[PDB]
């Protein structure tokens, strides 16, 4: 089966922690957009907001909503010990009802991009060197071996330019699949108006595939904002977000594993959410 879902943070746009009831309402609202629906959820961390290493409360919400989970461990900033502890506790506390929903586990999100020259200046925090990322991948594989998650596939999420950076080549060799992050909206060194969005997306995916050594490339993050500042030639608007949804999203949905960015984020700038904060009014026509 092909995964179709959304990316979800551990906090709300204002930075406050999300709890089980918040995740449950999101997962249910995503299902209620199309009656092959959005039934999957990608997370960036195993750790509940406001805690040191308590399992994120998205897990019990997903069990109740039967939501598929693409788990994430955050690998930058030296906190993998707590991520691994939370993963161990999640397996222990929630058992098979949890394991049965897990489609894969991503070790790190954009850690190689933050360890690049332009990524350093993004002020998104520190990154991780390829060798340490490989060691983290091996630690997670050891952690799930023998457990209910022993059949979950291990990947990593990063930008297409970090995948194509040949110094990062050994990371690919330790993964089961590659997670693609790419936004033509942010590619301001190119002619990145909405006019060129599909071309730029397709080109970046083909670049990632060229270094994937025949392993699957999942679309773990892309989207186009409805409001926000102009980036090069790219402008945020409901019309432009709609055009990107139609040109890039509709051909992916149900064909390539895809997690859109994102369901809802009112208050954030740029705002990438496709539904308003009532979790019912779409920002544009979502039919394909
Ligand atoms: C293509 O990809 C490659 C590889 O991914 C990428 O190359 C990296 O480029 C980035 C950006 O320029 C470099 O990051 C800088 O690294 C500076 C040096 O610190 C690093 O190197 C230290 C020494 O490394 C050698 O020695 C040790 C000990 O002998 C050995 O273990 C190593 O393997 C290596 O041989 C190393 O000690 C240091 O470790 C610290 O940081 C890591 C980060 O995860 C963390 O574990 C700890 O905090 C640890 O103390 C680190 O690995 C560094 O000074 C510099 O920091 C600047 O930026 C940050 C913010 O971004 C500021 O906070 C800071 O004040 C500085 O302004 C930055 O981190 C990295 O070294 C390259 N890696 C390699 C392998 O070459 C290319 O850029 C990519 N190409 C393009 C075009 O983007």
What can you see in these coordinates?
There is one protein chain. The chain has an 8-stranded parallel β-sheet. It is globular and about 50 Å long. The chain has one domain (1-288). It starts with a strand and ends in a 28-residue tail after the last strand. The chain has helices at 20-31, 58-65, 80-99, 111-114, 117-120, 130-144, 160-163, 169-172, 197-209, 238-252; strands spanning 4-8, 40-43, 68-73, 102-109, 153-159, 177-181, 217-221, 258-260. The chain has 288 residues and is an alpha/beta fold. Strand 3, helix 3 (80-99) and strand 4 (102-109) form a beta-alpha-beta unit. The relative contact order is 0.13. A molecule of 7 linked components (NAG-NAG-BMA-MAN-MAN-MAN-MAN) binds next to helix 5.
Topology:
Blueprint: E1 4-8, H1 20-31, E2 40-43, H2 58-65, E3 68-73, H3 80-99, E4 102-109, H4 111-114, H5 117-120, H6 130-144, E5 153-159, H7 160-163, H8 169-172, E6 177-181, H9 197-209, E7 217-221, H10 238-252, E8 258-260
Helix pairs in contact: 1-2, 2-3, 3-6
Bound molecules: a molecule of 7 linked components (NAG-NAG-BMA-MAN-MAN-MAN-MAN).
A molecule of 7 linked components (NAG-NAG-BMA-MAN-MAN-MAN-MAN) is lined by residues 112, 115-117, 120, 126-130, 165, 167-168.
PDB class: hydrolase
Keywords: cell wall-degrading enzymes, 1, 3-beta-trans-glucanase, TIM-barrel, hydrolase
Assembly: monomeric
